[PDB]
Amino acid sequence: FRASEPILSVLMWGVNHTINELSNVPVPVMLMPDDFKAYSKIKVDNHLFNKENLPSRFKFKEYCPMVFRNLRERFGIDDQDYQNSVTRSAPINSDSQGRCGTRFLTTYDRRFVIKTVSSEDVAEMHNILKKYHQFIVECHGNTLLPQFLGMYRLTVDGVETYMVVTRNVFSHRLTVHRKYDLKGSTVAREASDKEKAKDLPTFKDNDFLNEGQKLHVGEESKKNFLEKLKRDVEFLAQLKIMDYSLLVGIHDVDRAEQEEMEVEERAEDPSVDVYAMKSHESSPKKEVYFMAIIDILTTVNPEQYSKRFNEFMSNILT
Amino acid sequence: KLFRASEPILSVLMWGVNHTINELSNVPVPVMLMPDDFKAYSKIKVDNHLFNKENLPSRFKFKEYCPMVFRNLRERFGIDDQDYQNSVTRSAPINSDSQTRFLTTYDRRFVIKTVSSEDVAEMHNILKKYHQFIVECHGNTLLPQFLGMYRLTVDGVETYMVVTRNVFSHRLTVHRKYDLKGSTVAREASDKEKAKDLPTFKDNDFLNEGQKLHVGEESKKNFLEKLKRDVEFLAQLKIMDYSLLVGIHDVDRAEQEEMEVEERAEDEEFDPSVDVYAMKSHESSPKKEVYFMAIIDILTAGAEISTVNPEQYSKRFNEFMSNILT
């Protein structure tokens, strides 16, 4: 069975079809250059058949099936785990920010996020995809960079929709009590918005800066984190990357307890290194940080944005 | 991991019966078939660029007629969809002895025929009646048991196919074959068929050969009763020109053939049908042979303009076949 929105049903049907389809096409010894130009396209038109959840006519297109499929194993994700996260239960909405873009979804299990990109972006992914993949080859899938697991284009009512599935920054288990969108840019737009008075506000640079923000990772982990950062922002620099920021999610354990308790009261802490990473445990007082670089796709010119982004983040940690 | 065949047409088939059957595994089995189900269909258009082409065409279309009705016709004939699927996708379907094309799954259990646009239409006209018939016979007929009907397109060329459980068994070999039409003497014999392969002998060939066909007296009854209602059903419609396929399997001969095969692994280097699976077989009154009989062409001098009609062909077909077995 499928979802609510006909597009969410065509998505589940698509990631299911494409992944199964891929289960029969053998894993190559290496990715040829054509694999970064290939794609799969499917046009369905069922008459009086199978329509209790799917549109009678729709199209589904998967960009570079082989390269993302490899990017998946490279990020240690089992295709079938990927498939079930998307087809088991319809993907719930998260919060599609009030600006550039359209929507932000997340699988029922909160593990993967489905961002609806633009035709422009889908073209950017293709330009960068080859280099980015080679980068991922020599990092062993260890980066604060978004780990792209798949990119699709669904069409319903002749309306094309582009999407870019990616493992989320925040964990699928633990809750993000306080969030941030550190751009690192020299003082411009970065503060009080209606957001501050929202469900979960996306505070910016100066908000975080004035809060004398506590981010004690240690001296062992802060090193390893900042060293990733150095090579990422440097990679992006190698290829003109447009205004990207660092996503910051904070999880207060003690607060989590209380919330968890009330839930248990009405009837009457740990991330997972691999299966929900990007997490960072606090040196002392119970907290977990979630940090990773974010809008790699799409006022001074960005090559200089690198050193600034790293220098801003270089001071956060302790 | 399921690779494909030689001809791109056989690869689009395996891809199709695999896609459609999996697709069907998610659409629940109805309490009953609505009238729309006999008018429905599923259509798929594939266009892969530089992807998945070591066995499949980069662009192709696949269409399945009335997915729900055949899927029901399948369980009604006691066939598991996945068993059906694997027979067609596990290993490319080999060619048979086409009288356009005649294929058979690697396991010899299902036969794939290439029908015409006309036939595909005939299937639709009869499909609701035929299905109702199958409902009240418990899948026990000498009539072809249609399991699926498709239309594949490659190089913009449409191809129609009608999958059906075969008359002959997938295990036992047919030593002598026949195509008994029952029609009053005419082309009641085979020309270049007598060639050397497995000849499709005809009425008069069978008639002159003093044909022994001892089915018994308990099975002869059940067969003729089963035949009476089929040819009568076909009559009720308009169907004609159909014949009865007859396959004979000599056990003792089979032994020898089987032995030499075992003998070569020595030098150079249980027995009958399954009522359920091979359900058209008939044991001979004496332990010596197995017969395979079922109606077949259900779709498509002096004075030509004044011949035999549907209602007349019925009684004749049953009367001719009524004497074959004893």
Curated annotation (Swiss-Prot), chain A:
It catalyses: a 1,2-diacyl-sn-glycero-3-phospho-(1D-myo-inositol-5-phosphate) + ATP = a 1,2-diacyl-sn-glycero-3-phospho-(1D-myo-inositol-4,5-bisphosphate) + ADP + H(+); 1,2-dihexadecanoyl-sn-glycero-3-phospho-(1D-myo-inositol-5-phosphate) + ATP = 1,2-dihexadecanoyl-sn-glycero-3-phospho-(1D-myo-inositol-4,5-bisphosphate) + ADP + H(+); 1,2-dihexadecanoyl-sn-glycero-3-phospho-(1D-myo-inositol-5-phosphate) + GTP = 1,2-dihexadecanoyl-sn-glycero-3-phospho-(1D-myo-inositol-4,5-bisphosphate) + GDP + H(+). Keywords: Acetylation, ATP-binding, Cell membrane, Cytoplasm, Endoplasmic reticulum, GTP-binding, Kinase, Lipid metabolism, Membrane, Nucleotide-binding, Nucleus, Phosphoprotein, Transferase, Ubl conjugation. Residues 3-317 form the PIPK domain. GO terms for biological process: 1-phosphatidyl-1D-myo-inositol 4,5-bisphosphate biosynthetic process; autophagosome-lysosome fusion; cell surface receptor signaling pathway; negative regulation of insulin receptor signaling pathway; phosphatidylinositol phosphate biosynthetic process; positive regulation of autophagosome assembly; regulation of autophagy. ATP binds at residues 167-169, 179. It is found in: Endoplasmic reticulum membrane; Cell membrane; Nucleus; Cytoplasm. GTP binds at residues 168-169, 179, 295. Highly expressed in brain, heart, pancreas, skeletal muscle and kidney. Detected at lower levels in placenta, lung and liver. Residues 29-35 are annotated as: Required for interaction with PIP5K1A. It is an enzyme of class 2 (transferase). It is a peripheral membrane protein. Ubiquitinated by the SPOP/CUL3 complex. Ubiquitination is stimulated by PtdIns5P levels. The keyword Transcription does not apply. Homodimer. Binds TNFRSF1A. Interacts with PIP4K2A; the interaction suppresses ubiquitination by the SPOP/CUL3 complex. This is Phosphatidylinositol 5-phosphate 4-kinase type-2 beta. It comes from Homo sapiens. The gene is PIP4K2B.
